[PDB]
Each structure stands twice: as C-alpha cells, then as structure tokens.
Design a binder for this molecule. Structure first.
Ligand code: SF4
Length: 543
C-alpha cells in the first residue's frame, strides 16, 4: 500500500507518482492533509454554487478561503501539518454554515457534508479521497488536470485579490469547476470541455492579475537589474507577491537594511514604483531549487511570500520567514494572506545581526519587456521580422526545476542561430538569462516579460503581431514554443495557451504523469503537443 500519492509536479517519482515521500520533501501525512483540504474545498465549491443558483449571496470571504486552500497545496508552498489541519477545520465550519442557508439541501455530495475536527480523522478520510479514488483512467486524468489548472488560476486570482482586484465570475467559475470534478455523471467530453473552459478562465485570472500589478506599481519597463551585492545587511524576498514587497521596502526605509529579490521576485525590479527606493539592491541568485545554497550564502533573513520553498537546512532555518499561505514547521510565519498590513520589524531587526551578502555573481541583466513595453516597440519589432533581422521568436517561458536534464534548455538557447529572439517569463529564464546571447539590431535576444503570470504579456504580444500582419491563425506567426513546466501554475499557463488556439507547443523536460494515454492522444491530435529530445536534434526539427 502507498503511504501517499501525488503526481502534480514535473519531478514526480519516475514520472508516475510519489508513493512514499515527495521528491519535494512533502511527507505522507502532510500530503494526506492536503488531500482532505482539497476534497472539502471542492465540497465547499458545490455549496457556494448551489447558493448562487438559488439566487443567494456568498460573501467574498468564502472566495478567499477557497483560493487560500488551493494555493496552500501547490508544490513547495506549505509543509506545516498544523496549518493544514486547521484550514481543514476552517473549511468544514465554513461549508457547514453556508449549507445551512440553502433551501434544498439535496444531492449534496459527500465532500460537501463530511467533516472532522480531529487530525486523526482527517488522515483516514484522505486515504479514500485522493487521486486513486477515481478508477476510470480517462476521467481521473481530466479531473486532476483541471484541479491543478484550478490551483494555478487560484494563485493568480489571490494575488489580484491581495491588490484589491477580484471578479465574481472568476471565483464563481473556480468554485463550480471544483464541484464538477466530483460529478460522476460528466462524460469525458464534458471534462475535456471543462479543461478548455478552465484554460479560458486561466487567461482571465492572468489578465486580472496583470491589471492589478500594473495598476498599482505601473507598467513594467526596460530595466537593468544588478546581480551583484552590497555591503549592508539585507533581506532576501522570494516568491511572486509584490504587495509584501511594497510593505517591506517602505518599512526598511532608513534602517540601513537593504532589500534583494530571489527567483520570481526579480520582475518587481521592472516596475517604476519600486525604482524609487534607494535601498532596493539587486536580484540574488537563480531559480528556486538552488536556495539551499543561495539562501545560505546570502547570510541575511529570507522572506518567502509564496512557493517555491524547499525544506530548509538547519544552517539557515532560523532566518527563514514565511508569510501568506507559505509554511514550514519551525519557521517563523508573518500573518497576512490578503495584502493587509504586515509587521516586518522582527525580520528587519534580525537582519542587522547578520553578515552582509556573500557575492556569487556580478554584472546585470536586462528585463521588463511586458506587453505595454513591447507594444511600444511594435513597429520596430515588426520591421525586424519583415527585413529578416528576426527570423524566429522562441518562447521558452515557464518554470525551472532540479532535473539535470534541464541543461537541455541552456544548450537549446545557447545553440539558437543569432537571428532569433527568446521570449521568456517564469523562473525557467534562469537556464539562459545569465548567458551572453547578444542582440539583434539593438533588441536583446532574451526578452523577459516578467513572472510566470507574465506569460500573459507574451500572449498579448502574439495576438498583436497577428493583428498587425493580418493573419487568420495565430499559429502562422514565426513563433516556436519550447516551454518548460514544474508545478500547477505552469499547468494553468499551458491550458491558457491551448484555449487561445496556440499549437505545436513543445513541453519538457517531461510530460505530466497525470496525462493518460487517450488524453495525451487528444492533445497530440488537436493541439499537436510534443516533448523534447536533444538540444541539437530539436534545433533542427523544431525549425
Ligand atoms: S509535489 Fe511533486 S515531488 Fe512533491 S509529492 Fe507532489 S508530485 Fe512528488
């Protein structure tokens, strides 16, 4: 018997699933608590949906619990059994009262009704509501593909909500989509249709977050980020939440403590607003998976606003602060999951007692090519395509990971002819944002759109070129898609691309284990998805 079963991220054991201990570090019991949190949440999804159907209101506070639950179960997000158990209790209470409000409490699934307050009971319930619970291969593949897509969506929705932006149609769809993954009467065609609709709402979440980020901190602009370090003690902030960064910087003003970014917080450097704080140093390190090394050589406090957090080493566990839905037993947690005021004076005091950062690289990188910035260079990018200056755009956005086969992406980018342009977003950029690919007619051969949620800009840019060149099919543009994925956020980006009609997508370093043969077949026949081989072989085939 398996102590657990999880295959939501690309590093899943044998690309089949984790049964004893997650490669990520997630323990059997933590994964069980996560399986219960999802079940009762979907259960809460059905209740909130029935209420809206009866014409009744559902306070937004409910939409926040749902998103918080989902996000907390994303890879490298929360490993704290105490916070998961309590969130399971919170969800049981919440759904128990919303359901009291219904008029016709009929047909409510088990997930909607079941409840427990004792951790031991939650672990038993989990043992029968996890993945395996769905027998039929094709319907399981689709139910979990949507659920993961819904995890990524929720995360983007929460960051938009943290900035005060939220749409009722988004929260309503999410909650209804979750309720449908428990419906035994949905055909496979229904689930395929729901997979595409999810992708659609995927585009909405990213568009909602794009607006929230840009509206509060300005449109990203061409920026030069220093990757070297200073001499003052500092705090390294990681993740994707920009709100926490505004508070951290306002509060670190005048204390002598500098602020650095890590992994997916690099893009914050691209915003005009944050450029007004003198103590906002550079971006330290690379993708998340090198944090055991980089968090250590940074010497100062490390703030994790979201995933990806790798189980800490004792050498720096004491200076690791989590916040929002992030969590690790033994690591100090700063309360706040809705952009409310956060008190970072403890982490700022802690930094004054730490050695300044130990430099590991010097120089700088260019970035800030989001939709608003590239559209302003449109005519210039278009004259380059027309003249043959830029023979091909290569989208390599996505998420990075530990797999050493990912050296592929570094060789791919390194081997591309010098008349091509790489478009990136997401921490997958680290595999090649530190090389020297030069430029084409003054346009960098690596255009960083931003975070993974900024794949949205790459999408906008493409639709724009299709309009300009008056093409009927977006796929007729000189764009090759060589995307890398890791967790559920990369999975909602993919479904967004599929809903937008983008085809010929190459996914790697491997294809999701939760994609069953027949389901994988449809992706191949309808959107022509493919995997990768050698960088030299694909540099020939892909073109
Ligand atoms: S999140 Fe990935 S590594 Fe961790 S248990 Fe899941 S599938 Fe395995």
């Amino acid at each position: 018997s398996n102590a657990m079963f999880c295959y939501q991220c690309q590093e899943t054991v044998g690309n089949k699933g984790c049964t004893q201990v997650g490669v990520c570090g997630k323990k059997p019991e933590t994964a069980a608590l996560q399986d219960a949190l999802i079940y009762v949440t979907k259960g809460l999804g059905q209740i909130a949906t029935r209420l809206r159907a009866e014409g009744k209101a559902v306070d937004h506070r409910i939409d926040r619990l749902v998103t918080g639950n989902l996000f907390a179960t994303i890879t490298n997000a929360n490993f704290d059994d105490d916070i998961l158990a309590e969130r399971v209790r919170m969800t049981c209470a919440a759904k128990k009262e919303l359901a009291a409000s219904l008029t016709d409490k009929s047909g409510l699934s088990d997930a909607a009704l079941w409840e427990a307050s004792e951790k031991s009971a939650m672990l038993a319930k989990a043992g029968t509501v996890g993945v395996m619970a769905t027998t039929d291969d094709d319907v399981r593949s689709l139910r979990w593909l949507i659920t993961f897509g819904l995890k990524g969506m929720a995360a983007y929705a929460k960051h938009a909500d943290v900035l005060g932006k939220h749409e009722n149609s988004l929260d309503a769809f999410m909650q209804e989509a979750l309720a449908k993954t428990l419906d035994d009467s949905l055909s496979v065609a229904d689930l395929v249709a729901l997979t595409l609709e999810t992708g659609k709402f995927g585009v909405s979440a990213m568009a909602l977050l794009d607006a929230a980020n840009t509206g509060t901190y300005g449109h990203p602009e061409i920026t030069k980020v220093n990757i070297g370090v200073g001499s003052n003690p500092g705090i390294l902030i990681s993740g994707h939440d920009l709100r926490d960064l505004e508070m951290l910087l306002k509060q670190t003003e005048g204390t002598g403590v500098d602020v650095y970014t890590h992994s997916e917080m690099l893009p914050a450097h691209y915003y005009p607003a944050f450029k007004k704080y003198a103590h906002f140093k550079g971006n330290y390190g690379n993708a998340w998976w090198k944090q055991k090394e980089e968090f250590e050589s940074f010497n100062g406090p490390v703030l994790l606003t979201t995933n990806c957090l790798v189980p800490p080493k004792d050498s720096y566990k004491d200076r690791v602060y989590t916040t929002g839905i992030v969590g690790f037993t033994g690591c100090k947690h700063i309360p706040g999951e809705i952009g409310e005021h956060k008190d970072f004076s403890a982490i700022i005091a802690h930094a004054k007692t730490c050695p300044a950062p130990t430099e590991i690289e010097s120089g700088e990188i260019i970035g800030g090519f989001a939709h608003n910035q590239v559209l302003a260079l449109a005519d210039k990018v278009i004259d380059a395509v027309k003249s043959g200056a830029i023979k091909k755009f290569v989208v390599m956005a996505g998420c990075d990971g530990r797999a050493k086969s990912r050296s592929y992406y570094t060789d791919f980018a390194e081997g591309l002819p010098k008349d091509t342009v790489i478009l990136t977003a997401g921490c997958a950029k680290y595999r090649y944002n530190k090389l020297n690919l030069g430029d084409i007619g003054g346009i960098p051969r690596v255009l960083d759109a931003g975070q993974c949620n900024d794949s949205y800009s790459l999408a906008v840019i493409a639709l724009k070129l299709k309009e300009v060149f008056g093409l009927e099919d977006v796929n007729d543009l000189p764009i090759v898609y060589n995307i890398a994925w890791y967790e559920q956020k990369a999975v909602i980006v993919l479904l967004a691309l599929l809903s937008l009609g983008v085809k010929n997508i190459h996914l790697g370093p491997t294809l999701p284990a939760f994609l069953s043969p027949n389901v994988a077949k449809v992706l191949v026949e309808q959107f022509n998805i493919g995997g990768i081989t050698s960088p030299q072989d694909d540099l020939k085939a892909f073109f």
